Amino acid sequence: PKVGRLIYTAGGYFRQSLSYLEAYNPSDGTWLRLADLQVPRSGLAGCVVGGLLYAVGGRNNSPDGNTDSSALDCYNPMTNQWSPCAPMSVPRNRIGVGVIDGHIYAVGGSHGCIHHNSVERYEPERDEWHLVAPMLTRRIGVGVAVLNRLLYAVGGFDGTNRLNSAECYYPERNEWRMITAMNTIRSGAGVCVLHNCIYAAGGYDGQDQLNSVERYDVETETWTFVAPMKHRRSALGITVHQGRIYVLGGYDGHTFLDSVECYDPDTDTWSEVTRMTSGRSGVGVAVT
Template identity: 60%
Template structure:
């Protein structure tokens, strides 16, 4: 048929039908696409309104009790319906009416285990595809919808409950969803409990957990806690809630707590003052052995918990012709950088660390065209709030300072103020927002690298005002004493220093003649140094970080340029590869590893 004749036929369609066949109304009528033009010139239409209109007519018939072929009874209540509609909405009713069951021939079918109100709601959904879920009816709708295998209603209830998740109800929702086979909702509720653990333990539902449930919860690697003492305190609170029945469970619960990550000070206080522990000598003995092992700096065999969010490398400040205020983080999995709120004051020569879930910047110097000023500042970035908070400053300014963390306490060693070089050490307590002066090193050190292994602090290399250093000193926090250990193979200041497994790694640095690409590590067990593969680029005033089983070297100065490149070391293969570039070259920046900021 020619296009002219087709147009003529379309124009001769009676006016009463013209609105029905307008193709522009694609929400109601959609031509079915065909790969070839039909030989008879026909068009295929899908009438989108038709199913809804059919349901509306059937619902009108139900309400007027026309053509109904089944009556559902609950107690004294009767509900007329059409078998075909119920069977189409529910696998339960489909099996009842089509599988040769005796109900297939019955006109009235009694139902049990459901309220009349809930059945009325489900029948209404079968005819309208609409349902209102709220706090009052969800506990009745979900079990009934599960029983009748009305999966769309089950999904609606699960979505509603997921949006209701709160520290005060998440345990109940997890148990409720498990009871009714809602696997996805249960998993989301369990993940919520782990993520919000510190809030959940303050709610009444936490105290209703069974011993098995509590053990299963606190064993999770992904339990989101700032320090293990929060888990310990939660266990004691749970026992105290019903000590007569629960005291006998404490020993098993303590085995699930990662007690080797508790600080000796915390354990000592619990052993002296916890009334629950005093009733159980076997628990006191167990914790006493851990306490002694920690004081002796024995190797910890337990694995640390994993954060709920991916681990990222935070980088703050640095120097590129002047001090920088840059603050950003790098995700090794996605290979992406994210810009974060700038430092309040530009700084280079600073050090950074994580303590109790927050990122800290310590000391440094603001080198600017207006003049240089050494810093004694301590600033904290809260990844949950995305903001900086100034904390108690150190006793003295410290540029090119070394920093380490033991038992969630921040230790700041060495550094300089003007021409004065420090040998001193001080410690910051985040709970008290207070610094305490400790025993000094034997040697003044700026550009010193600091690492922590088995709760011992190692100060490596640096510059004493006259010479670059090979020496390394070790600090014992229990004795408040420093002692020398085996010196490095190479003189280094401004090296990247970090603890990884039983090793202290020392990366690059400056030896008074040139920037270094060599890398060596100290085995804290055998007390020996050994070289490993060297980096691709020489670097001094670089920063290093450990994520998982990989060591990252970021930025630094190679003698000519400020580097933006980042190299990654694989200890298993003993090789370095370049993995990314920072947003700009820099040296003297502070880095630390922590959980990805929540606002991502």
């Protein structure tokens, strides 16, 4: 039932880490600029819990220095204000995040040369982070999405090898299992869930930025390709609004895209949507 939810994009990178927060309304194609991030952020992830948007991890890279972030910050769309939250145990650039049972999971990402396999869990009611079981693989530039209270970490770079592998976190048991590997090596893909499938869109295969898109069907256990995007991209934002996937921005090996494409699983087609207000990669994105 269409009730006016918006796609939020926070931070990003375009000649330095950005502070933009903007919200897009797919039903009229308009963009609204909102309160800036307090500290510039790129390579962060976004998510929504209890009507609030959270900006997790990332980095501030500019001529004033390159520093990874352990920060968590919370934006209330109803007040248009950002508030700091307790930081993570470690900085995590190119993090993946998923929400289960009202808790935020921060997965992998990097701090300097360290590629984390560690995973930690944020409880909003306590403003507290708790380390959980680490992944089986170190993963930066990892994609994460949640389906039926299971969390999937897909692809990335482990510090030596760029990855086609993926693994599944069972939060009640606090354990990780490898799942079927993807058809393609992808770091910096957009990973989301739609219906019974975990999608991995675009990314970097170690040579080229990708326009291919493949999905893992959790029932059949296979990765299968679907229609490719029009524009190749890694470090894209991805989210699901009213039953369709949207990808936002990213880097195509030449430019930082303002392109937004929208995928309809019913027809297996991507359509072009109104451009971002400016090209950028490495954004955090969520819907509320």
